[PDB]
Amino acid sequence: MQLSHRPAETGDLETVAGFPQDRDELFYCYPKAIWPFSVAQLAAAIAERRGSTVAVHDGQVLGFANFYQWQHGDFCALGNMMVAPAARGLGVARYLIGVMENLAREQYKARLMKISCFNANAAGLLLYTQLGYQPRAIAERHDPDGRRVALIQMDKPLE
Template identity: 65%
Template sequence: MPPSSSFDHRAATADDLSEIVTFAQNAEELFFCYPKADWPLSVGQLAATMAERRDSTVALLNGRVAGFANFYQWQYGDYCALGNLMIAPWARGQGVAHYLVTAMEQLAREHYHAKRMQVSCFNANSAGLLLYPKLGYSPSGIVERRDRQHQRVALIQFDKAL
């Protein structure tokens, strides 16, 4: 990441949604971060999923919304499962995902007293598969899923002690 980069994060708001829905550049990218969504991602779809999830958070890079994530599962005192991790195309490769995952780990500890974080990544998502081990996540399982074309895909599950 450039030395002049400034990172911050805050709770996502309704005003952020129109920006966040532009992060996935195609149907495959959307499937990686939100498998149940229909392409193209709409504000309505994202608002509905935010209502069902917890701690929807945006990462800011130099004051601009650059990433989004939330928890799709949370078990107080045990674990949180990270979901909907999306990075703006203009911000990729600048450390936003690393920053945002670390921020979400802190939220998991603070809000849920989580002892571990779980993440899942589809086999074709090489960026995610390379990111999570760098952040200390270890593979913990592989589950068969179906993509939008009903083809078999592998969902690789990762776990990290907090």
Template identity: 60%
Template sequence: MITPHRLSHRPAEARDLLIIATFMQSAEELFYSYPKASWPLTPAQVADAIDKRCGSTVVLLNDEVVGFANYYQWQEGLYCALGNVMVAPNARGKGIARHLIMIMEEQARTQLRAKRMRLSCFNGNTAGLLLYSQLGYKPYAIVERETPDGMRAALIQMDKAL
């Protein structure tokens, strides 16, 4: 685990697009973090997500971008919905996602006065489900979705009081 004092964060910028686009190593990973995108993830798709969403944030380790997330829905004073959670392959398993989610929770609470954070996680994303559960997120609905290869998937909707 990387200690939080070695990490920093800032709003995502145009110079980050190419780096973020390399985070997803397979079509399956991309589907889990950005279901509307097509494989392979491109800087243009990342730019589109930033343009259409709110609060796009990167986490840096030694000034290198290693994490990215944003809110795909938000209603000021009520809730934010966390999306596009991505971590660089060489930084996985080191606490980056946990740190990123905590940053996003704090920003939702302070900047958008959100009372709750929502997120959705596909049933096949075991690492995500375990992390979100450890961070206090509770399931409240399951919605059927279709994977890019036409298979059924369960999208587990979760939330947490901030």
């Protein structure tokens, strides 16, 4: 998987808004969104966030991520991490997380990256563990059916 990256563009949003395959996946990567996902919901997140970036391979947009918190000299918090279903398990998220780590360091002078994953998202928890993130805290949250879930907050030093 040779991959490139660039800022997200308007024409990318239809494709990216197709990445979550079901209500669970949408909850995991964007818990304030409501199913079905739409370009309007994606565009609204982009407008409130920073660093919205796509990963591209062989002319296809395969991954998306951004920051929902940014604090210069301090940390960024990575969210909306989503990969095309036909392209999972090929390193897209690993590549994109590295690009976002570099952007945090270079543009934000961040010392730390924060992420939070819902307990049911095994793939996400294992992704960030593989990339050297460690768990710090667990917070109670609710899913769209009002059921109690656990949000696992993790972080990683950027040096």
